[PDB]
């Protein structure tokens, strides 16, 4: 949950400090979104 | 170990070994004498030494 | 001639996190990867000492010996720079361990798992959600004494739990509490309770030690009686007398031939591995140590 | 084959080999490139390695 | 600055056998002297492991520690090029040993004499009237077992005689002869007559065993006395609810920690001296691994 909220709010509240860049991967979107198909 | 029943447990240890360092093999050592006014004192001289000390190791 | 391990933090540190680590400026940290670029998790001791899995002494010990050691060079929010440790090189190491133990020039330092509570040893990284736990680094004359007392105390604390009549907890606290070395006395705090089955950071050694000590007298006498030959070591005839009387009287026939080997084969592994633990893995040599500066030129 | 009074839910993870795409815009990242360095390992009798 | 070695063969090898040597590329072998040019009679482990004398493994082990180690690099019709191994350098290494094992990353590897097979270990050079016997390298955990497998045999075979009892001989072989590994089993060659260096090695153990036996603590005995009957663990399954009678005889006296501390104090020193005996050779620390190419990066 911290990871997701951070991706969203960092992208938002940036673009307008240190820009130390978070690395993003798509391997485990079930781990990200807490959903099982 | 002729007489061991008097002293209880502390006298068990006999001696220790350490390693002063490593020098050139295939060269061995040499003989010389100490320079004092007194007498010869034959002495072993080794060259190109590298001191690498080690803690004491018990033997028994 | 360049040895660096640059660790990239995924997220920026708090000002709190910085001052927490600046105090561990020169402390040794074990390193799982030798590559110049490494993950933050690899470097901690948290892999072996975790809230999740029971901490066992040999799990940490076996980990420390097969692990590269590194020294902290510069701590910045963006990344960590760690200086690797390699045999044949001289390094400058500072004393910052939470349990304080005074060092002296020309001593033999030791690396061992932290006997004391994790909070003193570990530093929480809340921004990155990792815990870097620092191994306890000690002079050798103390690291032996501290391990002897805490191990002996554990067996006594469980002895009274099996039976109240056996030993008094008062005398146990008296000898086993205080550690004296080189005119300096340090008090070590023992855990409050033994626990049901396994104490935190203890009893791994104890179960092995107490079985190896009972498997020994039967084995030692079996070895000699089969070992005597016509060319026997001269000292061998001598130390056959050193045994106590009752241990001499044993008959090897009582145990079956299937048992005797498995008692020996079970025992050898404990003894072979037991000896290594006493040695405390990696050993450091110190040249010059200045108490006011708190820095040692170790190699 | 009688149903006990409690039902179940089962969970299992599966692994895919997947082939991806990567788009990168024009002039997005900037690179600074250095001149390289040579160094010879000592002479081996038949060959030299740099 | 430069480490190398060329082994100049007197006569050209057959087109068949040069192919056999190239398969052994990247394997570590022992060379008697470190020089630019070396003879082939000082290359293999063949002299101390002959076809016409009884093989002593301890003797081979002693020879390995003393002798320099060279990583075989290249084979030609006329020459063998090898690189001597220095104390502080990183060397690539390959896995080609015929009693096959699969290593793990960052796994400490140990060099041994060819216990498993005489034929597997040595490549025959019938062109130059020689055979080159490569040592066997193993992951350290399994190596420590094989050493114990051997030392026990030189005692048990002595203890058990085939003529008096055929059955007893069969049972001892079951534990020592075979080494179990993950989904595999290997047979270990055992010398028919045990007169080799191990008996000498054993004499050094029995000197320590007779010493340690006298300074055993009592509190470590009773903890086993109580735990076996009252609680059950995997470790104490060897002792059933039956307890060995000697310990009840030895442990009758009450407990005093001060007396116990002296005994535990003494025991630590002799376990430290004792370990030197156990390693019995060289160790290789591995830093990486490639499974597909079967190559490590030792150090």
Swiss-Prot record, chain A:
Disulfide bond sites: none
Highest taxon listed in the record's lineage: Viruses
Location(s) in or outside the cell: Virion; Host nucleus
Role this protein plays: Self-assembles to form an icosahedral capsid with a T=16 symmetry, about 200 nm in diameter, and consisting of 150 hexons and 12 pentons (total of 162 capsomers). Hexons form the edges and faces of the capsid and are each composed of six MCP molecules. In contrast, one penton is found at each of the 12 vertices. Eleven of the pentons are MCP pentamers, while the last vertex is occupied by the portal complex.
Self-association and partners: Homomultimer. Makes the hexons and eleven out of twelve pentons. Interacts with triplex proteins 1/TRX1 and 2/TRX2; adjacent capsomers are linked together in groups of three by triplexes, heterotrimeric complexes composed of one molecule of TRX1 and two molecules of TRX2. Interacts with scaffold protein; this interaction allows efficient MCP transport to the host nucleus. Interacts with capsid vertex component 2/CVC2. Interacts with the small capsomere-interacting protein/SCP.
Family, similarity comment: Belongs to the herpesviridae major capsid protein family.
Protein name as annotated: Major capsid protein
Organism this protein belongs to: Epstein-Barr virus (strain B95-8) (HHV-4)
Lineage: Viruses, Duplodnaviria, Heunggongvirae, Peploviricota, Herviviricetes
Curated annotation (Swiss-Prot), chain B:
Entry protein name: Triplex capsid protein 1
Taxonomic lineage: Viruses, Duplodnaviria, Heunggongvirae, Peploviricota, Herviviricetes
Family named by the database record: Belongs to the herpesviridae TRX1 protein family.
Protein encoded by which gene: TRX1
Superkingdom, taxonomy of origin: Viruses
Function according to Swiss-Prot or TrEMBL: Structural component of the T=16 icosahedral capsid. The capsid is composed of pentamers and hexamers of major capsid protein/MCP, which are linked together by heterotrimers called triplexes. These triplexes are formed by a single molecule of triplex protein 1/TRX1 and two copies of triplex protein 2/TRX2. Additionally, TRX1 is required for efficient transport of TRX2 to the nucleus, which is the site of capsid assembly.
Assembly with partners or alone: Interacts with TRX2, MCP and capsid vertex component 2/CVC2.
Localization per Swiss-Prot or TrEMBL: Virion; Host nucleus
Swiss-Prot record, chains C, E:
Subcellular location: Virion; Host nucleus
Origin superkingdom: Viruses
Pfam families to which the protein is assigned, alphabetical: Herpes_V23 (PF01802)
Entry keyword annotation includes Acyltransferase: no
Cellular component terms (Gene Ontology): host cell nucleus; viral capsid
Keywords noted in UniProt: Capsid protein, Host nucleus, Virion
Major subcellular location class: virion
Annotated GO MF terms: structural molecule activity
Iron listed as a keyword: no
Alphabetized InterPro entries for the sequence: Herpes_capsid_2
Complexes and interactors: Interacts with TRX1 and major capisd protein/MCP.
Free-text function comment from the UniProt entry: Structural component of the T=16 icosahedral capsid. The capsid is composed of pentamers and hexamers of major capsid protein/MCP, which are linked together by heterotrimers called triplexes. These triplexes are formed by a single molecule of triplex protein 1/TRX1 and two copies of triplex protein 2/TRX2. Additionally, TRX1 is required for efficient transport of TRX2 to the nucleus, which is the site of capsid assembly.
HAMAP family per record: HSV_TRX2
Family: Belongs to the herpesviridae TRX2 protein family.
Protein name: Triplex capsid protein 2
Species whose genome carries this gene: Epstein-Barr virus (strain B95-8) (HHV-4)
Gene: TRX2
